[PDB]
């Protein structure tokens, strides 16, 4: 019972070279270079599912800082006064109100300043 490798070996190489579409030069044409490129792209993707959650909270805070100083208070004091008033709204929703409703955001700043009174 002799086994020939041709049909199976071709299907396994065609699978890797399809995941390497759009890469530069030999990284999308040659199996040896493309297999290395596919493994690195999977390492980075695992790492960047963690950094995506850091990069967005950093953007939300910098926008709440800008909108609060237009009302006469800094970020670190604005957050402290909201916890003293038992407001549970998080950074993502706060950074959405600041851009789309300037009047509702102002009402929140006045709630915080009365807590620190």
């Amino acid at each position: 019972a002799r086994v020939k490798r041709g049909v199976i070996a071709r299907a396994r190489h065609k699978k890797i070279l399809k995941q390497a579409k759009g890469y530069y030069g030999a990284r999308s044409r040659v199996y040896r270079v493309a297999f290395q490129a596919v493994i690195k792209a999977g390492q980075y993707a695992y790492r960047d599912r963690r950094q995506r959650k850091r990069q967005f909270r950093q953007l939300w805070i910098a926008r709440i800082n800008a909108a609060a100083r237009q009302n006469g208070i800094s970020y670190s004091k604005f957050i402290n006064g909201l916890k003293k008033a038992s407001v549970e709204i998080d950074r993502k929703i706060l950074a959405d109100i600041a851009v789309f409703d300037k009047v509702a955001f102002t009402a929140l700043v006045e709630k915080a300043k009365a807590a620190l009174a």
Partner: protein
């Protein structure tokens, strides 16, 4: 529902004029770079330019503290072997007073294609007059 992102075809920028007479160099510089980048707006976007245009007047009346007026030194190399040069704070106010303000501001901005474009919005003059009355600049007390 994704977060808002500013588009570079709908941004609104304003014009301001600031007087730099008797003001500390590095404390006036930090405020200018905050507004050239757009950090003072709730629409701030790290990959989009949302800053303002600023005109700086009286660039040769800026102030420093200590013995910095004669002790501070500026260095640069010309690219030829043994081509290290230097000048002091006295010497560059006498020669070209505008370079002092924008050397400080250029070091407080990001490095890259976008940081080079934020620098085009800064206009620095050595005297008390400018020629941008058509743009109608406003007064800013930094």
């Amino acid at each position: 529902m994704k977060t808002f992102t500013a588009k570079p075809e709908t941004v609104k920028r304003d014009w301001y004029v600031v007087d730099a007479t008797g003001k500390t160099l590095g404390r006036l510089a930090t405020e200018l770079a905050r507004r050239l980048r757009g950090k003072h707006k709730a629409e701030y976007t790290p990959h989009v330019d949302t800053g303002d245009y600023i005109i700086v007047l009286n660039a040769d009346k800026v102030a420093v503290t200590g013995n910095k007026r004669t002790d501070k030194v500026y260095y640069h190399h010309t690219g030829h072997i043994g081509g290290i040069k230097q000048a002091t704070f006295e010497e560059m106010i006498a020669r070209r007073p505008e370079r002092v303000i924008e050397i400080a501001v250029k070091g407080m901005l990001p490095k890259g294609p976008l940081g080079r474009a934020m620098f085009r919005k800064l206009k620095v003059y050595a005297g008390n007059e400018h020629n941008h009355a058509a743009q109608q600049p406003q007064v800013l007390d930094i």
